Design a protein around this motif. Structure first.
Motif, short mmCIF file in Angstrom:
data_model
loop_
_atom_site.label_atom_id
_atom_site.label_comp_id
_atom_site.label_asym_id
_atom_site.label_seq_id
_atom_site.Cartn_x
_atom_site.Cartn_y
_atom_site.Cartn_z
N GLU A 267 110.13 -2.14 102.18
CA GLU A 267 109.00 -1.96 103.09
C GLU A 267 109.14 -2.89 104.29
O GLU A 267 109.19 -2.44 105.44
CB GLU A 267 107.68 -2.19 102.34
N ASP D 331 98.94 -0.23 101.31
CA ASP D 331 99.25 -0.09 102.73
C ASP D 331 98.29 -0.89 103.60
O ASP D 331 98.69 -1.53 104.58
CB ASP D 331 99.20 1.39 103.12
N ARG D 334 99.26 -4.63 103.29
CA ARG D 334 100.44 -4.88 104.12
C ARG D 334 100.06 -4.95 105.59
O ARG D 334 100.51 -5.84 106.31
CB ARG D 334 101.48 -3.77 103.92
#
Lengths: 442, 443, 444, 442
Positions: A267, D331, D334
């Motif tokens: 990622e 997500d 992050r």
């Protein structure tokens, strides 16, 4: 007696460069005078505070020996070195294995995929250093991300053929705990046929017989080689013919953690989305696979003997596999942490240090000197400590670290230590012990 | 922040040292100095002592195996089959021309300062902390090599102080360790080379910045002195008559005084011959007095002496502080000298990044902030000064040098020398005696 | 498992103790056992405070010097106003009414203690030089304010306690040595015959109840008899020599004064003090170094004390034999021999010692008692003093080894007054201020 | 210039002991001459390495000010001091608040519940110090468990009346971030009526007006005082009359953490199951309530103005509330981490340290010196660093700790620092800055 922290970190770094043959670091000076797969991950961890460029070289050398089907073999042999048995001539992978690398001699079996953890440490060091140092680590990702995916995909597709989320082993050596009691009941079912003659080299170096496996155990380690050779190390034939087929819960937990680690690296560094998806799926699969093995009362994880179709119940440090990778219900992880800290393991009244013996001192299998049958291993102290920190157990990770270093303060960088007296055992100047010290300090 | 922690720094320094190890000698740097040098080998042994007494002892045994038959320890022991450095074994031609050179080592033809007794003391002090088998290794080194050490100190005293002035004569600026120091500029100005056989430098192929190394003109005179020595087969008895360069080095002399005293205390502790200890004390005392006789009446600063010109050499470099190492100045002059050390011509100069001793004063017209011994800060000098000051009982002043030494070293470049104002590392990176100084302080 | 503190933990704990014993402008030697300011504990407290606060360190010595008697003597206790638990207290010394030279505005004792104060000033000045201009100004202001005071303290020792100019200090009470029950004083004390001694109750052995760690009752009776003797002559310096039953020359105190004198002389040069004072200090430095050497065994170099009443050298096997190592002066051979005695098996090299440290009494001496104050235990204050003097002789490794082992011993965090030589058990008062000071200086 | 670790630790303990009035520590020697509620938790954290006994005293004295209804007041005034305003007289709490304790003198408002964290740190030190020290801490538990439960239950029931999983504040002072841009738009709708005259003391001590709130803001602060005063501090009547009513998402996350930490303690020391169940219930409710504020792209948490009924968008350190307590989808988290690194915060080019400024340097509300409007606060670095380690982010937490020590290596123990020049600001000798350093090294 004991070295200061700066002395110890210096003597460890001095040791690591001294075991460096040029582009590979031996796992020890004489006993393991070659490159081993999981040691090389630890050597890269230890080298990363010294030279990101040279830690990258260590992983580049191991991956250049990767098999065509993705398998990282557990040994990469040094050109023209003797001193160790079984050597290249005994494995004969160069002549018998169609997947073996063209320009490296290697063994025919695998070993745990600690490698993604080493890539994480390299990246975290590199990010604290120069722009040119980040460029070296990022260039290493660009070069080897595919190879790392093939490694993980080979484990998941070829050693978990039924998608049980546990890794199958065809040799106890692939577990890293050669003589662990985990494998005793599996090995009792291995009956050697015509075993070609051989003489051990390991107990020429370590002559105390109480510290190494027995001749009978070695007869079974080398018979399994003959079975593998007979089928030319063909993945598609091993399940039919191997007398040793076990699901290693510790290896699987490590695999779970590695897939997660690698996925987050993918990622962060914009690797292909399909790869990160696969890594996350394997992470979850092998986490669930570890949990399915666990005791209802204590949460201890079990190995599974594929041939006998039975759970292996022993009292070793692999029972704590689920702590590394998570997934246990809250209540049962507490039970497991209490087993870890209680008098069967870290809280046994007689231990010199508050560290995890490879086998419980209360088990009947326990042997204070005998390799994986009881001694305290720094490599395990590090792995447990790094995984605990990653679970957010900051203090528990710190105490392991603190006792690890105190045990390490004699400067022998012993392969393992006697649990009760602290006497260093196994090889001295063991590279992954020096790596653990260097990571904790460096 | 680019700086390493103490354990990070000590680990990188040890990793440096083992990386420069060819097997039984450690090169002074990866490429610039790809052989064993005499006083670097002393420091490498100091740096190795906390890592492995056995391997520290090996380093000194290797250097002493190259000792000339008259006792001189040459300043280079070349590695077998290594190029990339000039002047190499072929330029010296000691293998064919020097009757005293060793039959099984390639060496240079000139000497270097006797820091070696200090390395022996550190080895012994580490070994006394590490138990019985380790003391035995150090003690057996003393049994094998006490004679060689004595011959080393007796060659300096009898062959380079033949008039018993208590000052060591040099026949080449390289023997001082400060090749291009302003100390030697007037002496070198009287070195007129004859037909110098052509050559090409190697040093500035590796350090290409011309501001950091000596000039071609200086090298022309360095190699010419080699020619004068060669024509006479390095015969000690001929050098006074023919050498165009003949200077008394007050800094070398002070080092020798300190070394003689160090070696004498070692001799007492380890029951070496009484007559040897007497000799060592006599030389300590004589070279202490010889250093003092050079000194300035106001400031205490020591002077070098040009034997050919018959002239005191007055320059503004760190060699002025030689008497601080060995003692003997009257109380009031040594105060003045320390005042010079700490004030604005040297350590207290306002533009210095660190409180360290520049090789030449930043207020001298000779000062050059990048050019080798003409101004940069040298970690080897920081260590020597710090170790000598502690030995004088100046604990705090020894501590401050050590502290600033470590701060400067904390970039991890282990540079040969640093720019005094900006801190930029200069000379070779990965220099072995800089790594040794870091290890000693933290080891 | 490991009950040890890391260096940062131990340093934090040491500074925490030091602040907890602070009453405002004076620090107590201990929380309860010694609940007042002691003269040489105060010098060590100032040493400990210098890495934390040069201002508060300067205050500690200011307070001590405000207790200085009019003739220059620094008395060994400045009693904290209105606090008890210690005997003999100000009601017993009676110094406000009996000593013409007591300070008008301070309650103090009537005897003295070793002059380590100049060492404390050196440490202050070294720290302040590292801290910056404002801090250097505080320390320099203290020298302008106190230099005359320091000179009078040194001149009073030189003139009133070395009246025959023999380079050694006379004490009139073993308490002035800092080592109350040292074997050193046993024969002199054996000639102290108490008379009508007004009754009293000990307070020290209520705090420290174990009798194996403190002097006996009979020793305290002799300690309180000398008090009556000097009280009987109004603590008059001119009268003391004809009436005191205890008159010993202390060679350890003497070597300390020699060191102090040299240290203070060198401060005086650096800070441009009157030339007449520096020369006088250099004179006393040499006189007392020679007076210490004059006591020493020609073979071993061991320094002896002197019973001026018996007119006899005091040969005993205590840490005080090593006094010449602190001040210099011995011939080479004599000093090598002395070092051999120090590291040999009669002292630091004894095979049963837990730490490589100097026991107050040699374990092979018949006078050795492993628990009993100065008759055997390892005292961190002596380890610091020896270590700091050793470094100053240039014995870098010797001083480093003592500091290292001193930190190993203190790394239990008890900051004990003294430790058992063999087991390392903490003894005496816990939270002893100068033990905390030693650790702070070794690490601050 | 800069102190060694041992020197700085010795100086931090010196400061801490010198601010000890005996059974309570002042948040600062002069500016904050009384005990503050979350300073007191940080003081207990700083005292744990020095004296578990004294750390326990610190929280006993705080909990002895606990109001009858459970609220921990944000100031426990020291008997006799008069160098701070608003004091005992301006709060009129000892006469108007029926739940104010007898014999204490406290404020009338609350502050974030960092206290469980101080309890865990105390317990961790005590477990490493031996049997008697363990007993001290476990006896604090028996003594104070019901009191801690009552403090949490008051926040869950009385400051979360609608069961929204967010804490309602009636004074900006209750967030600990007095003049944060967070509250500007709610404060702009506070119209002070007849405000009795007053003289600030805070700017007598800190004279530079650029470092302290303005007079107009103090007017609003002392006006909100009049509102709760006129209604006798009654919980049931505050929502009808208070003209400042905000949900504080940072405070809410801290409560979430605290609840989970106190639950785990309760399990460890066998407290009643009903309390543990409740604590876990509140931890999840407030974890969910924090996640419900966040931007679906960035993850940044918003505060909520209950009166205006609108989300409060500002760019302050508080946006990162969800990083402390967990909850976000992968997500979003992050994305929020990239916001925390990167140029608007820790990654700003002109920051002297890699630390989190209280306000984004790119916000138009930024002021590099003005209290909570920009400067870097060692209390937040510690809090972020400790919560990060709890999430398992070992390296992230190690970087803040490293940078936080480098910044504190001047020994001023400043309240906050100029983000660009590193200049010490606020009160010098600030107790929780000393505590942060001690814990990072104790």
């Amino acid at each position: 007696p004991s070295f200061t922290p700066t002395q110890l970190a210096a003597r460890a770094a001095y040791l690591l460069r001294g075991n460096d043959l040029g582009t590979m670091t031996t796992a020890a000076p004489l006993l393991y005078p070659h490159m081993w797969s999981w040691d090389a991950a630890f050597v890269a961890i230890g080298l990363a505070p010294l030279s990101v460029e040279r830690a990258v070289v260590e992983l580049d050398t191991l991956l250049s020996a990767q098999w065509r089907n993705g398998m990282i073999p557990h040994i990469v042999f040094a050109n023209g070195v003797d001193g160790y048995f079984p050597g290249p001539a005994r494995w004969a992978t160069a002549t018998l294995a169609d997947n073996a690398p063209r320009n490296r001699l290697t063994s025919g079996i695998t070993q745990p995929p600690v490698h993604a953890i080493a890539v994480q440490r390299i990246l975290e060091h590199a990010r604290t250093r120069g722009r040119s140092t980040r460029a070296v680590a990022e260039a290493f990702l660009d070069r080897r991300w595919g190879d790392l995916m093939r490694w993980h995909r080979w484990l998941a597709e070829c050693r978990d053929r039924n998608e049980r989320g546990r890794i199958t082993l065809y040799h106890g050596w692939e577990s890293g705990m050669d003589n662990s009691p985990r494998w005793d009941s599996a090995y009792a079912n291995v009956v050697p046929g015509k075993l070609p003659e051989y003489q051990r080299a390991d107990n020429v170096i370590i002559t105390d017989p109480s510290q190494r496996p027995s001749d009978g155990e070695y007869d079974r380690y080398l018979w399994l080689l003959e079975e593998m050779k007979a089928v030319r190390y063909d993945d598609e034939r091993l399940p039919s013919v191997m007398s040793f087929q076990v699901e290693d819960v510790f290896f699987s937990a490590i695999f779970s953690v590695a897939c997660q680690v690698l996925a987050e690296i993918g990622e962060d560094y914009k690797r292909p989305h399909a790869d990160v998806k696969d890594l996350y799926l394997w992470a979850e699969r092998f986490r669930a696979g570890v949990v399915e093995t666990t005791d209802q009362r204590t949460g201890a994880a079990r190995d599974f003997d594929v041939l006998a179709e039975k759970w292996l119940v022993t009292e070793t440090a692999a029972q704590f596999a689920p702590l590394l990778c998570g997934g246990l219900p809250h209540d049962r992880e507490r039970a497991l942490l209490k087993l870890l800290e209680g008098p069967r393991f870290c809280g046994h009244p007689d231990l010199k240090y508050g560290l995890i013996p490879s086998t419980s001192p209360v088990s009947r299998d326990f042997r204070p000197r005998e390799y994986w049958r009881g001694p305290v291993w720094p490599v395990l102290t590090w792995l447990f400590s790094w995984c605990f920190a990653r679970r957010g157990w900051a203090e528990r990770a710190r105490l392991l670290r603190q006792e690890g270093l105190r045990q390490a303060s004699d400067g022998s960088f012993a392969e393992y230590y006697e649990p009760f007296t602290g006497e260093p055992l196994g090889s001295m100047q063991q590279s992954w012990t020096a790596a653990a010290v260097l990571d904790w300090l460096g």
